């Protein structure tokens, strides 16, 4: 079966700016109390990140993919579950599935068929607040496929509406010469939901050696049956695109990145 939703709202692409974000470890090397300069794919500073509201209210079209992407979201009760990756995503080309369960997350690389509104909705049960998922309607079975993997999940707290959103998930996805590299960080905030100031470094997580051409992708989020049929809580996320640039990075004494500067922003930056 292929169930589709009727109660959702469409909003224009909201524009925001990060002011400091998009810095990750470029490789696996230890450097201490030094200044390094490197050229690689980074999110440009002060860019126009696109903001999508998912609050009942869904906003998840298919977005273009090129030279990886930066995806950042804050949300409690874990309504987001994963993504898909491919070029046509219709039962005829190699496809990739990422889906984060409360159990071990699973990674799949197979042919797949998809519904118009595929998702992993959890039916709300009065017996248990963290009730088991009910309608995970994305595919039944396409055919023989290529790659399967299982790993530990990334976060927790299936339920909760605490005042301070301790869930800030930042991810960067790249695909280079047959390797799919994921950089991830999970940091808490106790302030307004907008993009924070400051600085943080995204430690590397994993690289998957498959080798495919990826040009489009789409996010996957669950949905509750709490009221009025299909109604969810509040969630949102931000999408940004990478570009090739040269950065200057400052490795501290302990070996951890503490500051960075973009050498294509303004004359003071490049003379630095």
């Amino acid at each position: 079966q292929c169930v589709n939703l009727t109660t959702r709202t469409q909003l224009p692409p909201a524009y925001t700016n990060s002011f400091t974000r998009g810095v990750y470890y470029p490789d696996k090397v230890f450097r201490s109390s030094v200044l390094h300069s490197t050229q690689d794919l980074f999110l440009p500073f002060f860019s126009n990140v696109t903001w999508f509201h998912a609050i009942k209210r869904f906003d998840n079209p298919v977005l273009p993919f090129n030279d990886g992407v930066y995806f950042a979201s804050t949300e409690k009760s874990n309504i987001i579950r994963g993504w898909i990756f491919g070029t046509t995503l219709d039962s005829k080309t190699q496809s990739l599935l990422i889906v984060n369960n409360a159990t071990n997350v699973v990674i799949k690389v197979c042919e797949f068929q998809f519904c118009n509104d595929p998702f992993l909705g959890v039916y709300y049960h009065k017996n248990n607040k963290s009730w088991m998922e009910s309608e995970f309607r994305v595919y039944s079975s396409a055919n023989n496929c290529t790659f399967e993997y299982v790993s530990q999940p990334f976060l927790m707290d299936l339920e909760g509406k605490q005042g301070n959103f301790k869930n800030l998930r930042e991810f960067v996805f790249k695909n280079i010469d047959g390797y799919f590299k994921i950089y991830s960080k999970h940091t808490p905030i106790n302030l307004v939901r907008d993009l924070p100031q400051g600085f943080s470094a995204l430690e590397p997580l994993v690289d998957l050696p498959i080798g495919i051409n990826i040009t489009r992708f789409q996010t996957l989020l669950a949905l509750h049956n709490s009221s009025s049929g299909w109604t969810a809580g509040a969630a949102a996320y931000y999408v940004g695109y990478l570009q090739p640039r040269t950065f200057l990075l400052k490795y501290n004494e302990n070996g951890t990145i503490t500051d960075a500067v973009d050498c294509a922003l303004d004359p003071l930056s490049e003379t630095k």
Binding site: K28, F30, F147, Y179, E203, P209, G211, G255
Partner: protein, 360 residues
């Protein structure tokens, strides 16, 4: 020899740069891991024939070969790409495994570019074939006392098929151009014929269990290749090491620095490798180059005498035999006796130390 002359005058000279010689070499790499479960295929209940031989995809694991290879449990063996002895050193993106049981009397037709009943209709290989073919004598179990006719093989085929293009449909083969009517008729043949394997069979008639291991190259990153070994680490010696594919020579010492659990390599401002994490056990080691420095010869003019002295620069001369003594800040000088007396300089060495010729 260096000065290209048969006379030498008073004064120090420099020549014959010195460097310590290493002893041995070592390799250190992660533990064995997800080895491929091909044994259960080899130790399965039902094995395949040549019409529908088991074709399987193998990836994302290490395939142990040497233990199975050098084990006497095989009969014949033929790698078409390279020497099997180093099979573990070639890594494959994906492995096509073709396992089957046939009659050995046609095994010569297994090889590419061969003609025969099994090499023309069902089982084919390209001229540029690479994979290794392994066969084992298996008359003990495959053979049936009453005749194992469950096995079948493509006796006939109208037109030869491309390699690895198995056909499992068993449409009634038309030997002649006359139309075939009914399930069986004139010039109508069953393409599949039943094998006969019995203990009373002789050489060649005994069933052979054969695996052909082809693989794909470089379209995706290589994943499947044999396990690799390692040797116990040693310290305080100028040795050769291959750590995570980085080959170097130096002396390994413990370190007080602490890496992040994700970085492996330590570098300096000069951008050279000096700290490495061991792959087996989680620890951090510093690398120090073993000593090196040019040699100096101190001598009066050859007109006067022939005695000389040798100065090793920047070397603690407790390390001279591995190539009267006296150490100064510039290195260690041998061949000369130092005195408590003081004079004016005649031949300078450095750090205030000068040498000369004097009485005996």
């Amino acid at each position: 020899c260096t000065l290209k002359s048969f006379t030498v005058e008073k004064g120090i000279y420099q020549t014959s740069n010195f460097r310590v010689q290493p002893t041995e070499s070592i390799v250190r790499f992660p533990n064995i891991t997800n080895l491929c479960p091909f044994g259960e295929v080899f130790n399965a209940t039902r094995f395949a024939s040549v019409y529908a031989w088991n074709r399987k995809r193998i990836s994302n694991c290490v395939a142990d070969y040497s233990v199975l290879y050098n084990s006497a449990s095989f009969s014949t063996f033929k790698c078409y790409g390279v020497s099997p002895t180093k099979l573990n050193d070639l890594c494959f993106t994906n492995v096509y495994a073709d396992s089957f049981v046939i009659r050995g009397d046609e095994v010569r037709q297994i090889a590419p570019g061969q003609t025969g009943k099994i090499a023309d209709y069902n089982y084919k290989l390209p001229d540029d074939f690479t994979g290794c073919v392994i066969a084992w004598n298996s008359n003990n179990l495959d053979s049936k006392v009453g005749g194992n006719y469950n096995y079948q093989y493509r006796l006939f085929r109208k037109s030869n098929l491309k390699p690895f293009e198995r056909d499992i449909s068993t449409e009634i083969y038309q030997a002649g151009s006359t139309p075939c009517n009914g399930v069986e008729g004139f010039n109508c043949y069953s393409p599949l014929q039943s094998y006969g394997f019995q203990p009373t069979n002789g050489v060649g008639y005994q069933p052979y269990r054969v695996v052909v291991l082809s693989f794909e190259l470089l379209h995706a990153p290589a994943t499947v290749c044999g396990p690799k070994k390692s040797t116990n680490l040693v310290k305080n010696k100028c040795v050769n090491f291959n750590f995570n594919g980085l080959t170097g020579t130096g002396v390994l010492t413990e370190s007080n620095k602490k890496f992040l659990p994700f970085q492996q390599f330590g570098r300096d401002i000069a951008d050279t490798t000096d700290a490495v994490r061991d792959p087996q056990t989680l620890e951090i080691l510093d690398i120090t180059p073993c000593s090196f420095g040019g040699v100096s010869v101190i001598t009066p003019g050859t007109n006067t005498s022939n005695q000389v002295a040798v100065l090793y620069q920047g070397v603690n001369c407790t390390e001279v035999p591995v190539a009267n003594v006296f150490q100064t800040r510039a290195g260690c000088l041998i061949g000369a006796e130092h005195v408590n007396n003081s004079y004016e300089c005649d031949i300078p060495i450095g750090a205030g130390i000068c040498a000369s010729y004097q009485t005996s």
